[PDB]
Structures are given as structure tokens and as C-alpha cells.
Amino acid sequence: EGQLTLLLGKLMTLLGDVSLSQLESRLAVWQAMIESQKEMGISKEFQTALGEAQEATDLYEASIKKTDTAKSVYDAATKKLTQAQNKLQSLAQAEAAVEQAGKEATEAKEALDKATDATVKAGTDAKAKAEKADNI
């Protein structure tokens, strides 16, 4: 009963709402003040600081979506193994399915763990490039 899978699905939603959502917003404020002022005829090296951040934040949209696929990929692997695991002690071929559902699943987690580390990575920087907008 590793329904930490359901907990995780919930953390991903929160990460999306509290991390990614505020970041994307912060930067949207800047783009709209860039445009609202770029119309009154009034940005220089600032648009480099901002360019870089809305790319990290955009790489961070992508990355979360990449770990969210990876987990769907993994949830199929884990439920695959509980089907095979189950109908085996309903009694050599059944014994193999479990070994291979098992292999498919430790592999899915490996890919899942990877896509998380790479999401940890992307957001850590997006946080940073967006704080570096302490331009004067």
C-alpha cells in the first residue's frame, strides 16, 4: 500500500499552484509593466534578467509535466505488478510475470526519481533567475 502515489499527485498540484503559479505570475507582472510602459514611450539590461527567468520558469512548466508523465508511467507499472502479484498466489509462468512486472516497476521508479531530481533542479534555478530581477 504505497498510496504515497496519491499523496504525490496531490503534492504536484500544490507545487503547481504555490511554486510554479506564483513564479509565472510575478514575471507576468513585469512583462505587462514592460508593455504598459513600452507604450507610454518609456527597459534595458532588465529585459535580459527577465528573459532568462521566463525561460527557466518555462523550462519548469515543462519539467513538472515531464515528472507527471513519468509518474503515470510508473502508476501503470505498479498496478501492473499488483495484478500479476495477485493472481499468482491464486494457485512458473505466473512466477515470471511477477519478476517482469517487478523489473518494469523498479525501472519506472528510477525514471520517476530522475524526473523529480530534474524538477528540483529546474525550479531551484527559476526561483533564482526570478530573484535576480533585483535590477535597479
Curated annotation (Swiss-Prot):
It is found in: Secreted; Host membrane. Residues 43-136 form a coiled coil. Disruption phenotype: Mutant can assemble a fully functional needle complex and can secrete (but cannot translocate) all proteins traveling the SPI-1 T3SS pathway, but the mutant is defective for intimate attachment. The N-terminal region mediates SPI-1 T3SS-independent secretion. The C-terminal region is necessary for SPI-1 T3SS-mediated secretion. Membrane integration requires both hydrophobic domains and the helical C-terminal region. Belongs to the SctE/SipB/YopB family. Component of the type III secretion system 1 (SPI-1 T3SS), also called injectisome, which is used to inject bacterial effector proteins into eukaryotic host cells. SipB/SctE1 and SipC/SctB1 are inserted into the host membrane where they form a pore and allow the translocation of effector proteins into the cytosol of target cells. The core secretion machinery of the T3SS is composed of approximately 20 different proteins, including cytoplasmic components, a base, an export apparatus and a needle. This subunit is involved in the formation of a pore, called the translocon, in host membrane. Interacts with SipC/SctB1. Interacts with the SicA chaperone. Purified SipB/SctE1 assembles into hexamers via an N-terminal protease-resistant domain predicted to form a trimeric coiled coil. This is SPI-1 type 3 secretion system translocon protein SctE. It comes from Salmonella typhimurium (strain LT2 / SGSC1412 / ATCC 700720). The gene is sctE1.
